[PDB]
Design a protein around this motif. Structure first.
Motif, PDB file in Angstrom:
ATOM      1  N   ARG A   1      95.322  34.593  10.963  1.00  0.00           N
ATOM      2  CA  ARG A   1      96.458  35.508  10.978  1.00  0.00           C
ATOM      3  C   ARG A   1      96.761  36.049   9.588  1.00  0.00           C
ATOM      4  O   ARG A   1      97.221  37.190   9.456  1.00  0.00           O
ATOM      5  CB  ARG A   1      97.680  34.797  11.555  1.00  0.00           C
ATOM      6  N   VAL A   2      96.506  35.256   8.546  1.00  0.00           N
ATOM      7  CA  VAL A   2      96.744  35.719   7.181  1.00  0.00           C
ATOM      8  C   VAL A   2      95.764  36.825   6.813  1.00  0.00           C
ATOM      9  O   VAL A   2      96.143  37.831   6.201  1.00  0.00           O
ATOM     10  CB  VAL A   2      96.662  34.537   6.196  1.00  0.00           C
ATOM     11  N   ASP A   3      94.491  36.661   7.182  1.00  0.00           N
ATOM     12  CA  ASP A   3      93.479  37.646   6.809  1.00  0.00           C
ATOM     13  C   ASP A   3      93.691  38.970   7.536  1.00  0.00           C
ATOM     14  O   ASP A   3      93.451  40.039   6.965  1.00  0.00           O
ATOM     15  CB  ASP A   3      92.080  37.096   7.094  1.00  0.00           C
ATOM     16  N   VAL A   4      94.142  38.921   8.791  1.00  0.00           N
ATOM     17  CA  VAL A   4      94.291  40.145   9.574  1.00  0.00           C
ATOM     18  C   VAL A   4      95.432  40.997   9.027  1.00  0.00           C
ATOM     19  O   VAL A   4      95.274  42.203   8.806  1.00  0.00           O
ATOM     20  CB  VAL A   4      94.499  39.812  11.062  1.00  0.00           C
ATOM     21  N   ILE A   5      96.595  40.384   8.802  1.00  0.00           N
ATOM     22  CA  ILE A   5      97.759  41.148   8.358  1.00  0.00           C
ATOM     23  C   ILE A   5      97.542  41.691   6.950  1.00  0.00           C
ATOM     24  O   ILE A   5      97.971  42.806   6.629  1.00  0.00           O
ATOM     25  CB  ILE A   5      99.028  40.281   8.447  1.00  0.00           C
TER      26      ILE A   5
ATOM     27  N   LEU B   1     101.168  61.050   9.071  1.00  0.00           N
ATOM     28  CA  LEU B   1     101.271  59.766   8.385  1.00  0.00           C
ATOM     29  C   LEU B   1     101.861  58.691   9.286  1.00  0.00           C
ATOM     30  O   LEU B   1     101.509  57.513   9.161  1.00  0.00           O
ATOM     31  CB  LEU B   1     102.112  59.910   7.116  1.00  0.00           C
ATOM     32  N   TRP B   2     102.759  59.072  10.198  1.00  0.00           N
ATOM     33  CA  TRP B   2     103.348  58.092  11.103  1.00  0.00           C
ATOM     34  C   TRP B   2     102.330  57.573  12.107  1.00  0.00           C
ATOM     35  O   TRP B   2     102.461  56.444  12.594  1.00  0.00           O
ATOM     36  CB  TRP B   2     104.549  58.700  11.827  1.00  0.00           C
ATOM     37  N   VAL B   3     101.312  58.376  12.429  1.00  0.00           N
ATOM     38  CA  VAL B   3     100.279  57.930  13.359  1.00  0.00           C
ATOM     39  C   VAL B   3      99.459  56.803  12.743  1.00  0.00           C
ATOM     40  O   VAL B   3      99.161  55.801  13.405  1.00  0.00           O
ATOM     41  CB  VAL B   3      99.389  59.113  13.778  1.00  0.00           C
ATOM     42  N   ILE B   4      99.087  56.946  11.470  1.00  0.00           N
ATOM     43  CA  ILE B   4      98.326  55.898  10.798  1.00  0.00           C
ATOM     44  C   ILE B   4      99.162  54.631  10.671  1.00  0.00           C
ATOM     45  O   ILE B   4      98.659  53.517  10.861  1.00  0.00           O
ATOM     46  CB  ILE B   4      97.834  56.397   9.428  1.00  0.00           C
TER      47      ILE B   4
ATOM     48  N   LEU C   1      99.915  48.978  12.714  1.00  0.00           N
ATOM     49  CA  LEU C   1     100.787  47.946  13.264  1.00  0.00           C
ATOM     50  C   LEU C   1     100.389  47.582  14.688  1.00  0.00           C
ATOM     51  O   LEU C   1     100.515  46.420  15.090  1.00  0.00           O
ATOM     52  CB  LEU C   1     102.243  48.406  13.210  1.00  0.00           C
ATOM     53  N   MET C   2      99.909  48.556  15.464  1.00  0.00           N
ATOM     54  CA  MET C   2      99.337  48.241  16.770  1.00  0.00           C
ATOM     55  C   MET C   2      98.099  47.368  16.618  1.00  0.00           C
ATOM     56  O   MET C   2      97.955  46.347  17.301  1.00  0.00           O
ATOM     57  CB  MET C   2      98.990  49.528  17.520  1.00  0.00           C
ATOM     58  N   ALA C   3      97.196  47.754  15.714  1.00  0.00           N
ATOM     59  CA  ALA C   3      95.950  47.013  15.539  1.00  0.00           C
ATOM     60  C   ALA C   3      96.192  45.629  14.954  1.00  0.00           C
ATOM     61  O   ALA C   3      95.376  44.723  15.158  1.00  0.00           O
ATOM     62  CB  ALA C   3      94.990  47.808  14.656  1.00  0.00           C
ATOM     63  N   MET C   4      97.292  45.444  14.220  1.00  0.00           N
ATOM     64  CA  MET C   4      97.641  44.111  13.740  1.00  0.00           C
ATOM     65  C   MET C   4      97.928  43.175  14.906  1.00  0.00           C
ATOM     66  O   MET C   4      97.458  42.032  14.934  1.00  0.00           O
ATOM     67  CB  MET C   4      98.847  44.184  12.801  1.00  0.00           C
ATOM     68  N   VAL C   5      98.701  43.650  15.884  1.00  0.00           N
ATOM     69  CA  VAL C   5      99.016  42.832  17.050  1.00  0.00           C
ATOM     70  C   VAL C   5      97.793  42.689  17.948  1.00  0.00           C
ATOM     71  O   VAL C   5      97.530  41.610  18.493  1.00  0.00           O
ATOM     72  CB  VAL C   5     100.213  43.434  17.809  1.00  0.00           C
TER      73      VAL C   5
END
Ligand SMILES: CCCCCCCC/C=C\CCCCCCCC(=O)OC[C@H](O)CO
Ligand SMILES: CCCCCCCC/C=C\CCCCCCCC(=O)OC[C@H](O)CO
Ligand SMILES: CCCCCCCC/C=C\CCCCCCCC(=O)OC[C@H](O)CO
Ligand SMILES: CCCCCCCC/C=C\CCCCCCCC(=O)OC[C@H](O)CO
Ligand SMILES: CCCCCCCC/C=C\CCCCCCCC(=O)OC[C@H](O)CO
Ligand SMILES: CCCCCCCC/C=C\CCCCCCCC(=O)OC[C@H](O)CO
Ligand SMILES: CCCCCCCC/C=C\CCCCCCCC(=O)OC[C@H](O)CO
Ligand SMILES: CCCCCCCC/C=C\CCCCCCCC(=O)OC[C@H](O)CO
Ligand SMILES: CCCCCCCC/C=C\CCCCCCCC(=O)OC[C@H](O)CO
Ligand SMILES: CCCCCCCC/C=C\CCCCCCCC(=O)OC[C@H](O)CO
Ligand SMILES: CCCCCCCC/C=C\CCCCCCCC(=O)OC[C@H](O)CO
Ligand SMILES: CCCCCCCC/C=C\CCCCCCCC(=O)OC[C@H](O)CO
Ligand SMILES: CCCCCCCC/C=C\CCCCCCCC(=O)OC[C@H](O)CO
Ligand SMILES: CCCCCCCC/C=C\CCCCCCCC(=O)OC[C@H](O)CO
Ligand SMILES: CCCCCCCC/C=C\CCCCCCCC(=O)OC[C@H](O)CO
Ligand SMILES: [Cl-]
Ligand SMILES: [Cl-]
Ligand SMILES: [Mn+2]
Length: 385
Positions: free
Chosen positions: A210-214, A33-36, A41-45
């Motif tokens: 930025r709103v749509d991505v997060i 679960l920590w990997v997902i 959070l990586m893909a958000m940045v």
């Protein structure tokens, strides 16, 4: 005013995510679960930098490489970006052919022949004809996503292992091969070349995009975590025959969907693979045009991408297994895509008044450092395990 981030979630759920989330819960429980949560959070940045690059510079990541970097380096990146496209379609074209097997009973070869006809015919349609189908495939993928959001509550998972699934604990090499596969399924390196395809007007979209991505990456993470937690509460620890494979993943929603779990799962998996493969083929054509300036006919690109899929089928490999392998190859292409991303977005002649904040650039490199570490961590145990 709610809707754009729903569209991004249904477009993010490709058969690559299904194979990694189901196998991650069946063979390793909640311990991934920590990997997902880390990959999202990586893909958000990562996908935020990919969108900031296209708004300010006006070009896409392939175009900037073609006009700024030497020719032998542009060719290397184009070949690297061409393999990321082939690994992406291999997960989606094979996922649609696997769903045909769950619906009709056709073999994997003939299921790909039907998938080959649909993929060819769907490319010739204009943008006005695919509008109902984009909502049709959006309906099935959305309902199957909310199905896991509700079932994860109704499955009554052992919260002692769920909460303990968020500590980064390793389970050998097999956990790393699948943890790497989850990162490649979430980040999607081909989008880093595709997403980008007046500071009052340019920082406006950076505020809007930025709103749509997060927001979208939030639900896609909740859906992916729910799917991995339901598969953990279903197959894990019970020694189920061929658990984790997509041929039995429908049983995760049997207590919720009743006797309709198998059809609604394969249909949602078919609609997810047919749409992501046709859009992925269109995305691969713009990538080659950005790197090389010319392009091959779109039918030739569509046929060459099918050859590795038909070869895997003609060999007898497990369809669910090769879907996870393609996501691992993608995670090796993330560092190759983050380097032109972290460098172009941190240049004033490229961004202008929209130079990336000095904190996000450092964090983006650490994300690349961790992925390079996790790829280098994995790549050892394969040949000396
Ligand atoms: C996917 C990111 C969410 C974007 C829009 C979601 C909010 C409105 C959507 C459904 C309403 C159902 C509410 C229960
Ligand atoms: C559980 C999934 C891991 C991601 C959740 C964080 C848990 C703590 C890990 C790193 C601290 C992050 C430091 C904050 C700066 C980046
Ligand atoms: C280990 C394998 C790395 C392989 C290739 C290097 C990839 C990163 C190299 C990219 C450097 C960026 C660059 O080429 O700089 C442009 C320069 O200004 C010229 O115009
Ligand atoms: C392996 C990576 C592939 C590297 C391909 C290099 C292509 C190249 O060197 O560019 C062509 C050159 O400009 C013309 O001789
Ligand atoms: C935006 C995220 C989507 C939010 C949907 C998640 C909950 C879905 C249905 C409510 C649960 C059913 C309970 C109400 C009837 C009893
Ligand atoms: C690790 C996973 C993290 C993410 C997981 C959280 C996501 C859940 C959010 C919305 C779904 C809520 C809808 C569920 C409501 C169902 C409750 C209900 O209807 O009760 C029926 C039951 O049979 C009576 O005992
Ligand atoms: C997300 C984790 C799942 C949250 C729902 C679990 C739940 O409902 O816990 C009730 C349990 O029966 C009480 O011991
Ligand atoms: C955005 C979602 C992730 C945000 C960060 C997650 C923080 C990790 C803690 C709990 C996970 C939330 C689900 C709650 C269920 C687990 C609670 C728990 O820790 O259970 C203790 C005990 O073992 C019971 O048996
Ligand atoms: C098998 C590869 C050959 C079969 C596909 C050929 C189809 C064709 O002739 O397409 C013409 C194209 O539109 C004009 O370049
Ligand atoms: C999936 C289709 C793309 C796979 C890669 C094959 C591209 C065509 C081969 C060489 C291009 C010629 C370049 C000019 C020399
Ligand atoms: C490598 C063996 C694969 C066998 C199937 C090739 C797929 C080509 C399908 C149609 C070609 C003409 C349109
Ligand atoms: C295996 C790692 C994959 C990619 C490694 C990239 C390292 C390049 C660093 C700086 C490039 C020069 C700065 C311009
Ligand atoms: C077992 C251990 C495995 C771990 C293996 C890796 C160890 C980490 C090594 C280096 C991290 C360097 C952190 C990255 C710092 C880069 C910051 C940066 O370059 O940003 C500057 C930017 O250009 C401003 O405008
Ligand atoms: C293609 C992605 C790069 C893969 C290879 C990166 C170079 C080896 C780095 C190892 C870090 C040390 C790992 C220690 C555990
Ligand atoms: C490279 C450092 C990673 C090696 C240390 C990590 C321990 C796990 C491990 O490497 O063992 C698994 C496999 O059998 C091979 O030894
Ligand atoms: Cl567990
Ligand atoms: Cl440069
Ligand atoms: Mn994906």
């Amino acid at each position: 005013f709610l809707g754009p981030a729903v569209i991004a979630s249904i477009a993010y759920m490709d058969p690559g995510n299904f194979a990694t989330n189901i196998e991650g819960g069946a063979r390793y429980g909640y311990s991934l679960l920590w990997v997902i949560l880390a990959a999202n959070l990586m893909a958000m940045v990562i996908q935020n930098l990919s969108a900031n690059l296209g708004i300010a510079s006006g070009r896409n990541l392939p175009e900037l490489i073609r006009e700024r970097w030497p020719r032998p380096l542009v060719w290397f990146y184009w070949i690297q970006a061409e393999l990321v496209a082939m690994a992406t379609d291999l997960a989606e074209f094979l996922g649609a052919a696997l769903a045909i097997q769950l619906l009709t009973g056709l073999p994997m070869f003939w299921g790909a022949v039907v998938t080959g006809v649909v993929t060819f015919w769907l490319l010739n349609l204009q943008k006005r004809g695919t509008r109902p189908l984009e909502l049709a495939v959006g309906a099935f993928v959305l309902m199957i996503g909310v199905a896991y959001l509700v079932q994860v509550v109704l499955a009554r998972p052992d919260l002692a292992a769920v909460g303990a699934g968020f500590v980064p604990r390793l389970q050998g090499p097999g956990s790393a091969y699948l943890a790497v596969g989850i990162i490649g399924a979430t980040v999607m390196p081909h989008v880093i070349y595709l997403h980008s395809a007046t500071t009052e007007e340019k920082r406006r979209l950076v505020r809007l995009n930025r709103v749509d991505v997060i927001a979208a990456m939030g639900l896609a993470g909740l859906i992916n975590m729910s799917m991995l937690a339901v598969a953990a509460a279903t197959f894990h620890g019970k020694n189920v025959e061929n658990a984790g494979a997509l041929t039995t993943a429908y049983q995760t929603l049997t207590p919720l969907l009743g006797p309709a779990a198998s059809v609604l799962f394969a249909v949602a998996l078919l609609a997810s693979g047919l749409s992501s493969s046709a859009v992925g083929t269109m995305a691969g054509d713009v990538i080659m045009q950005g790197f090389m300036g010319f392009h091959i006919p779109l039918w030739l690109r569509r046929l060459i991408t099918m050859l590795p899929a038909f070869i895997v089928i003609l060999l007898g490999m497990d369809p669910s297994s090769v879907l996870i392998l393609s996501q691992v190859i993608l995670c090796f292409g993330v560092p190759f895509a983050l380097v032109p991303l972290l460098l172009f977005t941190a240049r004033r002649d490229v961004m202008g008044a929209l130079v990336t904040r000095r904190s996000f650039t450092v964090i983006g490199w650490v994300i690349a450092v961790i992925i390079i570490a996790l790829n280098g961590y994995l790549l050892w145990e394969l040949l000396g395990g």
